[model samples]
Target: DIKSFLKPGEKTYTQRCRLFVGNLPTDITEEDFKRLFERYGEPSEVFINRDRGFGFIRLESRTLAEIAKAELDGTILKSRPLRIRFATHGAALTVKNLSPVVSNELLEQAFSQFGPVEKAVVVVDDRGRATGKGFVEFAAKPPARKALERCGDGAFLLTTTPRPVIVEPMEQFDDEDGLPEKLMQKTQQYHKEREQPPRFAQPGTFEFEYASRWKALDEMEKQQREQVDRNIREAKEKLEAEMEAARHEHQLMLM
Candidate 1:
């Protein structure tokens, strides 16, 4: 029942590899990977394979693509590197805020309780500090979800844990409301532009006066706005009174 969260308007089938760097130099390390990606509003995952000559990357959200594209595209590292193409099939279950006491080996060991890890990566930012977010890939979804549902709250399972351990898939997007809402405006404009001739006037219509619908609508809107304003004022005053009472009680205690 769990599904990858896709942002509004972004196709789930489409990957989240906003920044791609292929042909990386042999000397390029994972730190270089973070440097290239951090400009893109915090990369959720970074992959570097010195053996493969290239690796994949995924951004936190589609909204951060512009930042990545601007800072990373055409930027060089270790003398020569280029942002080439998006990678497919790099979706990963990620853990965040990992403790310094935890090594990549220990972290991987911790997650192996769920299943085999196809890939594991730890990131270091430009300042030579661990970003605390790392990626893990499992061959199947059940274990990944199990790990995610259990340990993905950004808490370290060990004694030195900082806070709640949060784990989740980095590439998921689930925002709705992507479609445009122009049907009502289009319908009204169509009605206004119609040039059809009027039907024959009824005999009794000459004596009848029709009230304007626009005027009625305007009055309704005004009344709704007034009601909303009145409710907001009432809520604000109630909150202020409650706060004042609490402050008075605290002052009496201090006295």
Candidate 2:
């Protein structure tokens, strides 16, 4: 059976939505969460579970995603540092409902106005049409937030809100399914898989594939052949000069 990875009613939202708040102190109330999120922008929805020590707050816009990621990424709330950003969406840093004319230069210029731009590229199809998406990474939060503020509205550069949603496809697994274990193992394995270095022939190894086509001429022999050609050319030049002189003498005698 082709088991569906998604749980019931967990379909990806079309709007650029992000989930924030983790390692939250158990005693913090939902209102405390709401208050923190409000500092960034209007919170569309806030879900808090006292027992889970975690919760999710949905932002009102893509610009809010940038703001929340900047403000709360490492900020402490009720003694617990928070993690924030657009949810990881399909192993790609994608934004939903992108404008068709969002060029690579425009995206970089827009985002870099925030801070030190690390990387920026727009996703495009073979026809060179915008994939309705792109990604930019900044070295710091201040500038990233600036980009979100400057471009998230559906104006200026694009017709759609520049709200970005991050999607993490691997978060559905539970402890009992051994998914976490497998994920950790794979991550660790990948970290060790460095590029293999070029191999040097071992001295004692049997030469199973030794083969050669043409033998290389000795340096001395090649030099000697070149010298012989030069000498022959010099003799030919002398003979030609003598013949020209004799012909001139005969013409003078006739005169």
Candidate 3:
């Protein structure tokens, strides 16, 4: 009755071509699947969670897995259709601290010793060269796992620079929804109307009040000054009033 992601001793790279079978028959036993998929070839493995009514299959190679997906996907076990697709998850790594000179090829080559590298991209949005950070996505999860095991945690260097590159995992969006989150993390700006107001206040400074001091000052510099929509004469008059008050205080002290 134990449910698990992978069987014992199975590596995640082998996890690349996993066929996710949906609408699986809950009553089918492990023997039922071997009899089902044995027509193509002996299934390397079949793990079905009865409660979930879906299963993931791992075959020996890509060709064998593709045949299983294409042929058995729509095939019925009892009354249910086994909707199948390539369970796409292995490795799309977030690489960091890459030297500015580290090109895509160099970063790919550095990790290529482990396995197939699908892509290596550097972030130099400003320079169009290198911003000393990038991402590397391997064709299979095993290569990415191996890259992290050896080169992760500041153990690996991609260029001649004194700093070693850092390797980390991508966000869960790609695995869960088949979409990446890099752009949203890098460039998106989230907005808010204002800071939280105090439930009770002594009123030393009026934060969260109508046109509070900090917000007003920010509006003056950011919006009014740049937009050129507001006149500077009023601001100059405010400054003059402050100077006049200070001079009057000094004169009263002299008397």
Candidate 4:
């Protein structure tokens, strides 16, 4: 259900490997952009839009993306002031070496100490066993960075296990090839659909009137609601199982 936190037309926050470059010269080619960015690190993919005067560079890792952002953000390119930043639409962190007994609530509580937690989930197998890995999403990067620094190797006291948790920024794309075209297609379609006037709006309406802001908001709310319902159901099932185990233990003592 961690994926439920994603909004419509929003790319996965894990693709922290990508950087958004702005104030690009219209004459700049993809090769020029890639060559410039490659100074920081090898870019796996480069996209330049001469008409939009901007481009995207997908580095091999989040570390490379950070380096490029820092070194190029205010640098001049072709007489234009270049702007660069991590394309992390939403800040998220990956938590590893978690205790098997750790639950979603526990992960959320542990991370909430640093900031408002938007979503937290522990990976589980088909048998419903914890996989010692989880993800925590924050509303922004500051809190996620804070949490990572403070608790990256700190022990979680929630279980008998003494293993320290490893925390790091969640990569946006799991694959080295960057975001898949299928995912990009949805975003492209959403933008194209939004540009078209709604059935109720006329051509003379303002651009905002034709926009589907409400539609996007509605979808986000629906996803949040579904995640909440799922959390409640899982919690109830866990509690019931615990109670049954306790009852069985008491009956064995009576025997």
Candidate that would win on TM-score = 3
Higher-TM-score candidate among 1 and 4? 4
Find the 10 residues in a row with the least total lDDT in model 1. 9-18
What TM-score, over all chains together, does every model reach? Answer: 0.33, 0.34, 0.42, 0.38
Model 4 deviation from native, Cα RMSD in Å? 15.4
lDDT of 4 at 206: 78
RMSD (Å) of each candidate, 1 decimal: 17.3, 23.9, 19.3, 15.4
Error of 1 at 28 (Å): 39
lDDT score of residue 117 within candidate 2: 55
Tens digits of lDDT, candidate 4, 43-160? 5557788899888777655566666787778888777788776665567889997887888888989888888776788999899888888999885678988888888555545565
* lDDT, residue 77, candidate 3: 72
Candidate 3 regions exceeding 4 Å error are: 1-13, 88-155, 162-166, 171-255
Better of 1 and 3 by lDDT: 3
Worst 10 residues of 4 by lDDT: 1-10
Model 3, span 42-142: residue lDDT tens = 45657888878877777655566667777887786787777778875558888886777887778878888989876677778754766667888787778
lDDT of 3 at 42: 48
Between prediction 2 and prediction 4, which has the larger TM-score? Answer: 4
Per-residue lDDT of candidate 1, residues 1-255 (tens digit): 323344653432234434556778877788876766555545555778977768777665544554556556667666775755545334368777566565666766777888866455676689868787777766456778778777744444643423455687778552422445564365767677654445644445542223344567889999999999999989968987887898799999994
